From Swiss-Prot, chain A:
Described function: Cytosolic calcium-activated calcium channel that mediates the release of Ca(2+) from the sarcoplasmic reticulum into the cytosol and thereby plays a key role in triggering cardiac muscle contraction. Aberrant channel activation can lead to cardiac arrhythmia. In cardiac myocytes, calcium release is triggered by increased Ca(2+) cytosolic levels due to activation of the L-type calcium channel CACNA1C. The calcium channel activity is modulated by formation of heterotetramers with RYR3. Required for cellular calcium ion homeostasis. Required for embryonic heart development.
Name of this chain's protein: Ryanodine receptor 2
Disorder cited: Ventricular tachycardia, catecholaminergic polymorphic, 1, with or without atrial dysfunction and/or dilated cardiomyopathy: An arrhythmogenic disorder characterized by stress-induced, bidirectional ventricular tachycardia that may degenerate into cardiac arrest and cause sudden death. Patients present with recurrent syncope, seizures, or sudden death after physical activity or emotional stress. CPVT1 inheritance is autosomal dominant. Ventricular arrhythmias due to cardiac ryanodine receptor calcium release deficiency syndrome: An autosomal dominant arrhythmogenic disorder characterized by syncope, cardiac arrest and/or sudden unexpected death, often in association with physical exertion or acute emotional stress. Patients who survive manifest polymorphic ventricular tachycardia and ventricular fibrillation. Unlike typical catecholaminergic ventricular tachycardia, arrhythmias are not reproducible on exercise stress testing or adrenaline challenge.
Induction: By TGFB1.
Family assignment from sequence similarity: Belongs to the ryanodine receptor (TC 1.A.3.1) family. RYR2 subfamily.
Assembly mode: Homotetramer. Can also form heterotetramers with RYR1 and RYR3. Interacts with FKBP1A and FKBP1B; these interactions may stabilize the channel in its closed state and prevent Ca(2+) leaks. Interacts with CALM and S100A1; these interactions regulate channel activity. Identified in a complex composed of RYR2, FKBP1B, PKA catalytic subunit, PRKAR2A, AKAP6, and the protein phosphatases PP2A and PP1. Interacts directly with FKBP1B, PKA, PP1 and PP2A. Interacts with SELENON. In cardiac muscles, identified in a complex, composed of FSD2, CMYA5 and RYR2.
Domain note: The calcium release channel activity resides in the C-terminal region while the remaining part of the protein resides in the cytoplasm.
Boundaries of the shown chain within the full protein: 50 to 84 of 4967
Tissue-level expression: Detected in heart muscle (at protein level). Heart muscle, brain (cerebellum and hippocampus) and placenta.
Modifications made to the protein after synthesis: Channel activity is modulated by phosphorylation. Phosphorylation is increased in failing heart, leading to calcium leaks and increased cytoplasmic Ca(2+) levels.
Subcellular location: Sarcoplasmic reticulum membrane
Length: 35, 241
């Protein structure tokens, strides 16, 4: 979605917003995947 | 900290803090590699011992930097990334202490780890030097404790559950089960003592039974058990208190 042309064309950020749910280390994530 | 006369200044204190942070990550990765494995091999024990020695030396150097209320160094550490390293070491201690105590072959490693914890708490106490009531450094350490609440909880449970042992075994209620002076109490009499004290819950009961190694006669020596576990608790837990 173009954001530089905000003056001419409104961006649609409702479908661009994301939420950062969990941040885990690589080894902890590997153990969780093993589980 | 700051070489005033020289044209260029290098922050040795911040460099030491960075090296501590790298050593913490290395130790955490090694712990994660031994997380699943029930037993630690001798080479792994040696590597843990060497890493613990290095971390202990770095902790002592950092403590010496900030003792003698060196306010500039204290502020530098407060605004540096020492807190993340302390949080990591707290998790390492809380999990490793539970893991190592169950087996009777890593008692020396447990002692080294607890000595490292003692030095870390000494560094924190040196950090708290000169703090006024409602001080910013005290606030930051409370924030760090809240961030690492679970590890602190498990460490405190560990200290509680290995400090009540001396009172339990010194109580006469424990003495009726073994009236004679041999002191070699059976596992089942141990188990009834667990519930006669009534402070030791079922989880504490099972964990101490697991951490107590017995002969083929199902009879443990409470004397060697207590001299193995209680005395180190009385030594390290004082700094936490």
């Amino acid at each position: 979605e173009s954001t530089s042309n905000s003056k001419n064309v409104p961006p649609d950020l409702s479908i661009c917003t994301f939420v950062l749910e969990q941040s885990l280390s690589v080894r902890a994530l590997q153990e969780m995947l093993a589980n | 900290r700051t070489q005033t006369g020289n044209n260029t200044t290098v922050n040795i204190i911040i460099s030491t803090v960075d090296y501590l942070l790298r050593v913490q990550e290395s130790i955490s990765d090694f712990y994660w590699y031994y997380s699943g494995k029930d037993v630690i091999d001798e080479q792994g024990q040696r590597n843990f011992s060497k890493a613990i020695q290095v971390a202990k030396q770095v902790f002592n150097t950092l403590t010496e930097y900030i003792q003698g209320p060196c306010t500039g160094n204290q502020q530098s550490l407060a605004h540096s990334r020492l807190w993340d390293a302390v949080v990591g070491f707290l998790h390492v201690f809380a999990h490793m202490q539970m893991k190592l105590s169950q087996d009777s072959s890593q008692i020396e490693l447990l002692k080294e780890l607890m000595d490292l914890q003692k030095d870390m708490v000494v560094m924190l106490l040196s950090m708290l030097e000169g703090n006024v009531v409602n001080g910013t450094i005290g606030k930051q350490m409370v924030d760090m404790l809240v961030e690492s609440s679970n590890n602190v909880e498990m460490i405190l449970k560990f200290f509680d559950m290995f400090l009540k042992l001396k009172d339990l075994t010194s109580s006469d209620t424990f003495k009726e089960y073994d009236p004679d002076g041999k002191g070699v109490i059976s596992k089942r009499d141990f188990h009834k003592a667990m519930e006669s004290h009534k402070h030791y819950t079922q989880s504490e009961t099972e964990f101490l039974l697991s951490c107590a190694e017995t002969d083929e006669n199902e009879t443990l020596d409470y004397e060697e058990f207590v001299k193995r576990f209680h005395e180190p608790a009385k030594d390290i837990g004082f700094n936490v208190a």
